[PDB]
Design a protein around this ligand. Structure first.
Ligand code: CHL
Ligand code: CHL
Ligand code: CHL
Ligand code: CLA
Ligand code: CLA
Ligand code: CLA
Ligand code: CLA
Ligand SMILES: CC(/C=C/C=C(C)/C=C/[C@@]12O[C@]1(C)C[C@@H](O)CC2(C)C)=C\C=C\C=C(C)\C=C\C=C(C)\C=C\[C@@]12O[C@]1(C)C[C@@H](O)CC2(C)C
Ligand SMILES: CC1=C[C@H](O)CC(C)(C)[C@H]1/C=C/C(C)=C/C=C/C(C)=C/C=C/C=C(C)/C=C/C=C(C)/C=C/C1=C(C)C[C@H](O)CC1(C)C
Ligand SMILES: CC1=C[C@H](O)CC(C)(C)[C@H]1/C=C/C(C)=C/C=C/C(C)=C/C=C/C=C(C)/C=C/C=C(C)/C=C/C1=C(C)C[C@H](O)CC1(C)C
Ligand SMILES: CCCCCCCCCCCCO[C@H]1O[C@H](CO)[C@@H](O[C@H]2O[C@H](CO)[C@@H](O)[C@H](O)[C@H]2O)[C@H](O)[C@H]1O
Lengths: 218, 213, 218
């Protein structure tokens, strides 16, 4: 339990120095990084913790879903459109949006129906997340357990803490990756796999400096 | 010492000790089973000893062809001698598989005797053979054995001289291992021998960085 | 004195109005301007202190480094690109980083090597700042002193306080000047010297509001 103890590796490595007074551990992914001083209030700290974990889970899902179709298309899978920031336009295409390019799957043709279904279902599930519903009741805002851990991988509290650290670390990495995806898609104009393939060959000029001159005023 | 701070796991007593172990693999919590106090230094020094010969022989044919006292048919690239047949091949009196089997059998004999001596100090000193038990005496530690044939020169009279020599050996091993790693990196990037890379930085100091390809 | 006593200049002048309880005196050049209440928490307020100090020092250095090259170019020495936001093409030109137009000086040719060099150097520098180092042990993050005040000009507490007040106000001036520089670069697309030259000639004709007509969407 190196992370949870009063001596943890911190975000500077061995040469860390000052650690915030309130950050005594007791939380997954505690690296003593509060340079902005935003979570000084305890309730604000709890709200920011909730935001962090929800964002981490959403970003892990987003990174997986932004990488998988592109990797499949590169590997040889047929798609109507595979670029992560272009996949939304398939609903406005004549062929329609078909899962894995198969007309026998989903075969969605209207955007309004998708929007209405998403609004209704996500409203229901977020209301459940805030007030408890069919899958259980609110015990901890972030870690409900029970029906959402059916296999019981977090029965042991020590293993529970270790899994918390693992999940938060993977999630923060995924969040950083999603920010990278957004900025690279708006700068280069090609998918993450295209950028990686460009960096694979001739990395000297396949970087941000190549496009550093595209936003000069004039 | 050693840039990053030490954790007293090693105090400098071991031959060739510097303390640059930021992770600390011999940490008893992180050490066990395969990890043995005797085994890791032995493995390090053997990888270094073979790196000596590897670094020397990766350039010896090319430098000998350069100076002009070896047959020019031996100027083959080090990777074309038969280590990786797909890249190329070099002429020989027998097939590479035959010499491979020969060398594997002989190295099997030698390595087996060495491993027996490491496991049991009386190997080839009290075993059964045609009079080589008395010619392969096990002296001192297994990693630095010596013997009637090993100590023919008799160098290393004083313990201070021994420690000086051994720290020199480990430093040379580390530099040779880094050199050989650079050898593979240059071979996989430029596709040419390291000696030609020397010819290039000597000829064109600003020839290239990495590969630019 | 005036800065530290109740008789403060304040930010509005005649309209002192209501003043935050924690922002009333006993601080370096406080004017009571907290209309959004970011720094109510003492920790938060301290963190804002160091953030403001560091942004101010970097703003001072950046403003000086942006002002000097164009002034020297107008002086007469050759400059390939004295414009502050055009310095990127210096490494993208074939000649390279000719310091003061001399190929015999610096004369860089690549960006990866120098960028990595600084990333390592400034990481070590900032790490030393936050967690001490061989240079010295920091007694307060905002104002360490010692090696960085080797002459001890601010040994007297009164001159120390006055110099700190001057440093804060000049840092805020550097803030505002850098913001002006950025907006000038985005809107006008030219350096500050051209802007001041244009404002000198026919000030009514050369106005900011000639560039407001082209911001219409469509
Ligand atoms: C030794 C030098 C060293 C330095 C100078 C830093 C400093 C940094 N770390 Mg880091 N770390 C260092 C070593 C290590 N870090 C970490 C673990 C982390 C984490 C988890 C994170 C950082 C982050 C950061 C960066 C953001 C902080 C900042 O903006 O200022 C910054 C480059 C954060 C980051 O990536 O923001 C961009 C972040 O989340 N560090 C470990 C393992 C314990 C190190 C081991 O040597
Ligand atoms: C920290 C503030 C910082 C700011 C505001 C800018 C601002 C800019 N840089 Mg930049 N840079 C900055 C740090 C750095 N730059 C560079 C190296 C470069 C290059 C090579 C280029 C820029 C360019 C630009 C411009 C891109 C539009 C923009 C004005 C581009 C430019 O100026 O084109 C005219 C360009 O080519 N920068 C390095 C070295 C690693 C920095 C180090 O911190
Ligand atoms: C390719 C040809 C090249 C040559 C012939 C030089 C040679 C030189 N460099 Mg340079 N450099 C060159 C490329 C590069 N330099 C540098 C990084 C530096 C630095 C930091 C400095 C020089 C300095 C110098 C000059 C020292 C002479 C002097 O001022 O007294 C001299 C012109 C020094 C100087 O300007 O004085 C100095 O401080 N160079 C980089 C980045 C890695 C280059 C990239 O290709
Ligand atoms: C918006 C997402 C988000 C949010 C709300 C948080 C929230 C938190 N993080 Mg966190 N973190 C995130 C993303 C996020 N993180 C990512 C992507 C990484 C990987 C780099 C980390 C890495 C990280 C470490 C290593 C540590 C924290 C810690 C913390 C806690 C105290 C720090 C704080 O006040 O942050 C509040 C943050 C915000 C209010 C977000 C504001 C962002 C604005 C929009 C600016 C963004 C600009 C950038 C480009 C707090 C619960 C510390 C802690 O206490 O451990 C639990 C700690 O040690 N985080
Ligand atoms: C936050 C999670 C998330 C979200 C919002 C999306 C969103 C989307 N995915 Mg997706 N996906 C995700 C995670 C996610 N993915 C993950 C984790 C995987 C890997 C198991 C995939 C694998 C995947 C495939 C294989 C396909 C989609 C497709 C789609 C699109 C059609 C939606 C549909 O009919 O179903 C839509 C843009 C379809 C598409 O057209 O993509 C371009 C499609 O064929 N997804
Ligand atoms: C061939 C692989 C190999 C192996 C198995 C080792 C093994 C070892 N090295 Mg080592 N080393 C190697 C390559 C290797 N080295 C190379 C290529 C370099 C050049 C940078 C070094 C430079 C190096 C230093 C500088 C130090 C070690 C040290 C050590 C020891 C402590 C590390 C540990 O706990 O594990 C251990 C015997 C430390 C020690 O004290 O060893 C006695 C130490 O200070 N190594
Ligand atoms: C925030 C501080 C800062 C920063 C980031 C820069 C950054 C830069 N300066 Mg600069 N400069 C600064 C402060 C700064 N300056 C100050 C305070 C002065 C007055 C002495 C100058 C005077 C100056 C001159 C005279 C020149 C630069 C040049 C340059 C560019 C080349 C960088 C180089 O070779 O390193 C130099 C590092 C030492 C680079 C954009 C050169 C350029 O590209 O034009 C150049 O000729 N600067
Ligand atoms: C043995 C070796 C080379 C041997 C080469 C041989 C025999 C070559 C033979 C031939 O080529 C010739 C001559 C030419 C032809 O005939 C073909 C063959 C036949 C192919 C290299 C070893 C090379 C060994 C290397 C590179 C070792 C690197 C180790 C590192 C970096 C360790 C780092 C750390 O462990 C520390 C020190 C401390 C920890 O806390 C942290 C970390 C970071 C984990
Ligand atoms: C720590 C700290 C401390 C102190 O206080 C200082 C400071 C600085 C303040 C801090 C920091 C912070 C940070 C770093 C942050 C970050 C953030 C992020 C990055 C986010 C993201 C975030 C992100 C996210 C969510 C994302 C998401 C995503 C998604 C869903 C996606 C989706 C999709 C897909 C799949 C596919 C398709 O085709 C498209 C779409 C539909 C689109
Ligand atoms: C106080 C208060 C109070 C109440 O309460 C209200 C509120 C709101 C809360 C608050 C407010 C605030 C504000 C206003 C802020 C601002 C800021 C800024 C402006 C910054 C800048 C800032 C700025 C800065 C740092 C800057 C920096 C810079 C640098 C480094 C560099 C530069 C450069 C150079 C040299 C050269 C090249 O070629 C270019 C460049 C690259 C460009
Ligand atoms: C065409 C429409 C047909 C009817 C479908 C829609 C009906 C309206 C939805 C009502 C949902 C009410 O749900 C609300 O009360 C339920 C009990 O009744 C709770 O549900 C709880 O009890 C149910 C049965 O008693 C169990 O099956 C659930 O596992 C349990 O969580 C939910 O936690 C709560 O969110």
């Amino acid at each position: 339990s190196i992370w949870y103890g009063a001596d943890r590796p911190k975000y500077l490595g061995p040469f860390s120095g000052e650690t915030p007074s309130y950050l005594t551990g007791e939380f997954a992914g505690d690296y003593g990084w509060d340079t902005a001083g935003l979570s000084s209030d305890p309730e604000t700290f709890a709200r920011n913790r909730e935001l962090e974990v929800i964002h981490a889970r959403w970003a892990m899902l987003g990174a997986l879903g932004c990488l998988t179709p592109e990797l499949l298309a590169k590997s040889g899978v047929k798609f109507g459109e595979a670029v992560w920031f272009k996949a939304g336009a398939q609903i406005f295409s004549e062929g329609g949006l078909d899962y894995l390019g198969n007309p026998s799957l989903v075969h969605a043709q209207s955007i309004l129906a998708i929007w209405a279904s998403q609004v209704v279902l996500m409203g229901a599930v977020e209301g459940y997340r805030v007030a408890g519903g069919p899958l259980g009741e609110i015990t901890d805002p972030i870690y409900p357990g029970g029906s959402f851990d059916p296999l019981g991988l977090a029965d042991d509290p020590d293993t529970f803490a270790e899994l918390k650290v693992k999940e938060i670390k993977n999630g923060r990495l995924a969040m950083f990756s999603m920010f990278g995806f957004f900025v690279q898609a708006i700068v280069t104009g090609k998918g993450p796999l295209e950028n990686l393939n460009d960096h694979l060959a001739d990395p000297v000029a396949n970087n941000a400096w190549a496009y550093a001159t595209n936003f000069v005023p004039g | 010492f050693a840039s990053k701070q030490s954790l007293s796991y090693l105090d400098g007593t071991l031959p060739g000790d510097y303390g640059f172990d930021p992770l600390g693999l011999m940490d008893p919590e992180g050490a066990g089973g395969f990890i043995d106090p005797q085994w890791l230094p032995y493995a390090e020094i053997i990888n270094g000893r073979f790196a000596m010969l590897g670094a020397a022989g990766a350039i010896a044919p090319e430098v000998l062809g350069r100076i002009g006292l070896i047959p020019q048919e031996t100027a083959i690239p080090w990777f074309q001698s038969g280590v990786i047949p797909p890249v190329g091949n070099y002429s020989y009196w027998a097939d590479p598989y035959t010499l491979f089997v020969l060398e594997m059998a002989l190295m099997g004999f030698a390595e087996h005797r060495r491993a027996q001596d490491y496991y049991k100090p009386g190997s080839m000193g009290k075993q059964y053979f045609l009079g080589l038990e008395k010619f392969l005496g096990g002296s001192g530690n297994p990693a630095y054995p010596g013997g009637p044939i090993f100590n023919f020169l008799g160098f290393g009279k004083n313990e201070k001289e021994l420690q000086e020599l051994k720290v020199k050996e480990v430093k040379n091993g580390r530099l040779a291992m880094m050199a050989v790693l650079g050898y593979f990196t240059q071979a996989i990037f430029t596709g040419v021998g390291p000696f030609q890379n020397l010819l290039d930085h000597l000829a064109d100091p600003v020839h290239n960085n990495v590969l630019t390809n």
